[PDB]
């Protein structure tokens, strides 16, 4: 997702599911990769629990 | 098939699967059925909710 060899165009973004695993944030919110994270509808804090 | 093994190839079940919310597969094994009593010999019995 993150880390994908090619991305989409936006014109064609791709929408994918996820299900029957765990969501751990801990490689992603707290890692320098991003110059840019924002949640809308949750603390980044709290997608672990 | 000479190979002394007993091999599925026929697998007639659908023709599509358009939207897969949910899939799995177990960990592989090697389906026999080996060793005999000349009786009907095994009951299995399932519940379902
Ligand atoms: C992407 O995966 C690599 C290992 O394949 C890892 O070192 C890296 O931290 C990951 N980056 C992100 C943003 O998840
Ligand atoms: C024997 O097994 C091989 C793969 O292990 C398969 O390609 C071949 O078709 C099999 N032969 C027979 C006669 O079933
Ligand atoms: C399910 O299939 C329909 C028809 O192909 C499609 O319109 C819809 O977007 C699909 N939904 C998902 C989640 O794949």
Same mark, same amino acid.
């Given at each position: 997702?993150?880390?994908?060899?090619?991305?989409? =165009?936006?014109?064609?973004?791709?929408? @994918?599911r996820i299900s029957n695993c765990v969501a751990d944030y801990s490689v992603?919110?707290? =890692?320098?990769?991003?110059?840019?994270? @924002?949640?809308?509808?949750?603390?980044?804090?709290?997608?672990?629990? | 098939?000479?190979?002394?093994?007993?091999?599925?190839?026929?697998?007639?079940?659908?023709?599509?699967?358009?939207?897969?919310?949910?899939?799995?597969?177990?960990?592989?094994?090697?389906?026999?059925?080996?060793?005999?009593?000349?009786?009907?010999?095994?009951?299995?019995?399932?519940?379902?909710?």
């Amino acid at each position: 997702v993150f880390n994908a060899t090619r991305f989409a =165009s936006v014109y064609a973004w791709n929408r @994918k599911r996820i299900s029957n695993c765990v969501a751990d944030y801990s490689v992603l919110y707290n =890692s320098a990769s991003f110059s840019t994270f @924002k949640c809308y509808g949750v603390s980044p804090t709290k997608l672990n629990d | 098939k000479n190979n002394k093994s007993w091999m599925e190839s026929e697998f007639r079940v659908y023709s599509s699967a358009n939207n897969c919310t949910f899939e799995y597969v177990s960990q592989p094994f090697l389906m026999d059925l080996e060793g005999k009593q000349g009786n009907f010999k095994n009951l299995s019995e399932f519940v379902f909710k």
